[PDB]
């Protein structure tokens, strides 16, 4: 029936930015998540420039990736 | 066990189906202004221009100007006083949002109307109007002496007594008196300013 006290903790992102987030306990050392929004591939904007569009349109086949293991 | 719902599709009116067979003529800005001024009671003034299409910046100024004339010329009961309060509160708020679209004459009338009305002044309506007209070029190019006379009288009543603005108005007011245009307002403003200089 009694809510717990909420404290603040510092979380460091992959880009070096810091955020204060609620936490039941107190941690002196900043917490480093393994993956964040910026590092994860799903959270990526789909706005592309003309240069990127031109690169996608003009592509030539390259099979070197498959034949590398035989050469080595 | 949880049912789901399908929103019925919207009903777009078919084309070439008149909305009404009655005769409702189109109204321009000039006609709306004439309608607003030709009002005799607060109720008629309130209903003279309603809706976002007609209740524009020019309509809000006209309502305040006409309200001042009716307040001075007539005595009202409780119900009419409530109507007057509603008119003032709505008109000022509209002006505070479309002020940048007002013309020189509308701003001059707005200052005069606000000075006469006894209700509390809105946030900074007078100051904002002064800032737009502070370029000193609009008053000089104000062909209609009515706008200049209203502005001069309004500031005198409000007791602004701006040194720069008044210095410009003095020669204009004297010229208007010589030309016999807006003598009553020009004389009133000059007399008030002269009294301030004496005091």
């Amino acid at each position: 029936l009694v809510r717990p006290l909420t404290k603040a903790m510092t979380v460091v992102l992959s880009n070096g930015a810091t955020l204060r987030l609620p936490t039941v306990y107190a941690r002196a050392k900043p917490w480093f998540p393994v993956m964040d929004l910026h590092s994860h591939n799903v959270w990526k904007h789909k706005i592309k420039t003309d240069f990127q569009l031109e690169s996608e349109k003009n592509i030539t086949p390259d099979f070197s990736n498959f034949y590398n293991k035989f050469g080595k | 066990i949880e049912e789901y719902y399908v929103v019925p599709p919207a009903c777009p009116p078919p084309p070439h189906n008149p909305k009404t067979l009655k005769y409702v003529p189109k109204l321009n800005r000039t006609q709306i202004i004439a309608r607003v001024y030709e009002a005799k009671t607060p109720t008629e003034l309130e209903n003279s221009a309603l809706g976002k299409k007609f209740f524009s910046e020019f309509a809000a100024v006209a309502k305040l100007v006409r309200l001042s004339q009716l307040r001075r010329a007539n005595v009202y009961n409780s119900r009419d006083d409530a109507m007057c309060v509603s008119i003032y509160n709505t008109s000022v708020r509209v002006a505070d949002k479309l002020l940048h679209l007002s013309s020189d004459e509308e701003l001059c009338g707005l200052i005069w109307a606000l000075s006469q009305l006894p209700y509390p002044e809105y946030e900074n309506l007078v100051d904002r109007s002064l800032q737009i007209l502070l370029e000193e070029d609009k008053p000089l190019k104000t062909g209609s002496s009515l706008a200049v006379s209203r502005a001069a009288a309004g500031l005198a009543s409000l007791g602004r007594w701006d040194a720069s603005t008044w210095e410009v108005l003095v020669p204009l007011l004297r010229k208007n008196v010589q030309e016999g245009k807006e003598v009553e307002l020009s004389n009133l403003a000059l007399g008030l300013y002269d009294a301030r200089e004496t005091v």
């Binding site: 992102l13 987030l21 936490t23 306990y25 998540p33 959270w43 | 949880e2 789901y4 399908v6």
Partner: protein
């Protein structure tokens, strides 16, 4: 006072995001726009190690405690399935609104969801039956299968070991499903489509 008493998302929604949605989707009235009403967190017996539809409340205390840590507000037992059964429940639940709702969403999106293996996007919204008030509401449902990603269950690892998964529902009020997606995108939650 060295305490977390503000809300970052609350400021973002009203002072940043709201105007952008208005420009994208003009509406006659100001209040006519996407709004997030509440978020409900539920833990049922099927999401726990216990294998039984109906269990005693003393066996669900641990899960109720877990929700309190995650949300910061006490949770409540689900109502009994019938009057005959009184001392047995079927799960725990908690509902949040306002600043507490926004804080939970921020932490979930920024830290927990990106570290979940099989996440691509939240499902599409579902429209519910209008209530007596006649308001149409859409619900977006998804689940979190790894509750041991929060940094709060590390103080007593043995105590919180049985915590496995949780379900989340969000209620949105908007004029159309497209508006719901626009709000979800503004909240930085990818949608699976």
């Amino acid at each position: 006072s060295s305490l977390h008493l503000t809300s970052r998302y609350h400021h973002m929604f009203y002072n940043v995001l709201y105007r952008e949605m208005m420009l994208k989707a003009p509406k006659t009235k100001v209040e006519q726009g996407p709004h997030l009403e509440s978020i409900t967190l539920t833990i049922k017996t099927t999401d726990t190690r216990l294998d039984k539809d109906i269990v005693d409340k003393w066996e669900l205390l641990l899960f109720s405690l877990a929700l309190e840590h995650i949300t910061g507000e006490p949770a409540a037992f689900l109502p009994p399935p019938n009057r005959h059964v009184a001392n047995k429940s079927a799960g725990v639940t908690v509902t949040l609104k306002g600043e507490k709702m926004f804080n939970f969403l921020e932490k979930l999106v920024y830290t927990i969801l990106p570290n979940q293996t099989g996440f691509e996007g939240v499902p599409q919204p579902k429209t519910l039956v209008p209530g007596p008030d006649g308001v149409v509401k859409r619900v977006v449902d998804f689940g979190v299968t790894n509750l041991l990603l929060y940094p709060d269950f590390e103080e007593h690892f043995g105590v919180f070991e049985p915590i496995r998964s949780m379900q989340v529902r969000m209620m949105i009020r908007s004029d159309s499903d497209e508006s719901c997606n626009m709000l979800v995108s503004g909240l930085l939650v990818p949608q699976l489509e």
